[PDB]
Design a protein around this ligand. Structure first.
Ligand SMILES: [Mg+2]
Length: 345
């Protein structure tokens, strides 16, 4: 089906959405439900009477959950938004996605959108250095990969399990490409602490238990008095991608789903709610930064290309497992089962 970019205002979409019962359900990729709390609060304040029933789980479990619900005709969500970006062209070809070009679709950087409107990049996430600014002075913030091998960072590092999250894994793929397996070998001698949940390193660094990590997201504009800082490398690669979102063809609440996606793309949402880069060409990067596509030391399309070859990803993941061990501990989102209809208690 051929569609044109939505020309309606948010309020015009919103009045139309209100007829649907006052709830839109979103299966969103993430480590913990709290990561979506800001979006939920902003959305529900902006559109009174419509609840953003967003449900967080690892992307690698949400996509399987959607595949199984499709197979059994028990589909629950209106919208899916994940970092497993290779799923979206597959679901498109399967015919289960609603072609919709949201408000602002024309301004989305072309590689961050499906040409027919089958899916859209919602916002940009990047994984790189996160440092404790009270433990480390600015001149000593580690920024390059080999900075983490210096003696005064031994025992002071906490890291997300690369074998539990493919975006984390891709950071290592790039670094091994450049510096070889010797980097991973030397890194283990630093006695890093590995954890599940990409939220956890930043959480424990904030409390002062660790000094730094190199596979974390973070605010480009930190809040006043923040003890942490997201810091890019000067030269070394970092990971970035556009989180992908789509509406299902069988969505029970298509107008509300449309509202959500159009709201995500709004310039205010892109700069005031989303905490990193925007997918839009007409949205200024935060002061001090360039557009994500202007950094020579990251390539969002490289993550997508990586994720398309499951065999290559698996082989690299398995080798990393031999260096860091099996991913230990409980899954941070909790265990949602096959048919979560609301967030966990
Ligand atoms: Mg030792």
């Amino acid at each position: 089906a051929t569609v044109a970019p939505d020309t309606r205002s948010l309020d015009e979409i919103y009045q139309s959405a209100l007829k649907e019962g006052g709830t839109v359900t979103v299966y969103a990729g993430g480590d913990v439900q709290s990561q979506q709390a800001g979006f939920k609060q902003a959305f529900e304040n902006r559109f009174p009477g419509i609840k953003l029933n967003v449900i967080v789980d690892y992307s690698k479990y949400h996509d399987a959950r959607i595949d199984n619900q499709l197979a059994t005709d028990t589909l629950i969500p209106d919208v899916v938004q994940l970092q497993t970006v290779q799923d979206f062209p597959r679901w498109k070809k399967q015919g289960v996605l609603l072609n919709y070009k949201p408000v602002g679709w024309d301004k989305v950087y072309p590689e961050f959108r499906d040409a027919d409107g089958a899916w859209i990049g919602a916002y940009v996430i990047a994984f790189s250095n996160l440092v404790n600014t009270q433990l480390l002075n600015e001149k000593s913030w580690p920024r390059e990969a080999n900075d983490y091998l210096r003696p005064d960072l031994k025992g002071n590092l906490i890291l997300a399990y690369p074998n539990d999250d493919d975006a984390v894994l891709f950071w290592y793929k790039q670094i091994v490409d450049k510096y070889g397996w010797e980097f991973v070998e030397k890194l283990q001698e630093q006695d890093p602490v590995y954890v599940r949940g990409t939220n956890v390193p930043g959480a424990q660094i904030t409390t002062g238990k660790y000094s730094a990590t190199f596979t974390s997201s973070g605010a480009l504009v930190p809040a006043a008095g923040s003890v942490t800082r997201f810091v890019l490398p000067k030269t070394d690669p970092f990971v970035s991608w556009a989180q992908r979102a789509a509406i299902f063809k069988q969505a029970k609440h298509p107008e509300s789903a449309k509202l959500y996606l159009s709201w995500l793309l709004d310039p205010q949402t892109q700069t005031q709610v989303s905490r990193m880069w925007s997918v839009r060409t007409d949205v200024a990067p935060p002061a001090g930064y360039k557009h994500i596509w202007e950094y020579s030391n990251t390539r969002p399309q490289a993550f997508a290309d990586f994720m398309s070859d499951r065999g290559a990803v698996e082989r690299f993941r398995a080798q990393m497992s031999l260096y860091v061990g099996e991913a230990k501990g409980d899954p941070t989102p909790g265990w949602l089962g096959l048919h979560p209809e609301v967030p966990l208690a």
